[PDB]
Design a protein around this ligand. Structure first.
Ligand SMILES: Cc1ccccc1S(N)(=O)=O
Length: 126
């Protein structure tokens, strides 16, 4: 069902939260080799999450589930905010700009925390 597809999507999102917090600890410790690998792992996780979310939105549209479509349109828009911040973080790491990396890291945390009430609303709407 679309609801179980969203639970699978939610788990992938939680996998990225876990890897992100490990990556933050590695960044603070200066373990740049670990950070590089975690950033690659996060990129793959966000790509998978994005695709699952798009399939869920398209299915809600085909089902005529207007409220779930509204919420998923809002949620995917916020997802792209987080994705843009993530890509800027990756670039900051490439460039050796730790000041920007720290900034983007905190921003991605706040964007993600804000979007959690909506994430829960979607589970209930589908
Ligand atoms: C953190 C991140 C990274 C890439 C895409 C989306 C997100 S978010 N802010 O969890 O929607």
């Amino acid at each position: 069902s679309v609801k179980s597809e969203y639970a699978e999507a939610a788990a992938v999102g939680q996998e990225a939260v876990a890897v992100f917090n490990t990556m933050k600890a590695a960044f603070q410790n200066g373990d740049k080799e670990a950070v590089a690998q975690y950033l690659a792992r996060l990129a793959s996780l966000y790509t998978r999450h994005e695709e699952l979310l798009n399939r869920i939105l398209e299915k809600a549209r085909r089902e005529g589930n207007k409220e779930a479509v509204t919420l998923m349109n809002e949620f995917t828009a916020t997802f792209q905010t987080g994705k843009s911040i993530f890509n800027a973080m990756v670039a900051a790491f490439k460039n050796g700009d730790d000041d920007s990396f720290e900034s983007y890291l905190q921003a991605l945390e706040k964007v993600t925390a804000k979007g959690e009430t909506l994430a829960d609303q979607i589970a209930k709407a589908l």
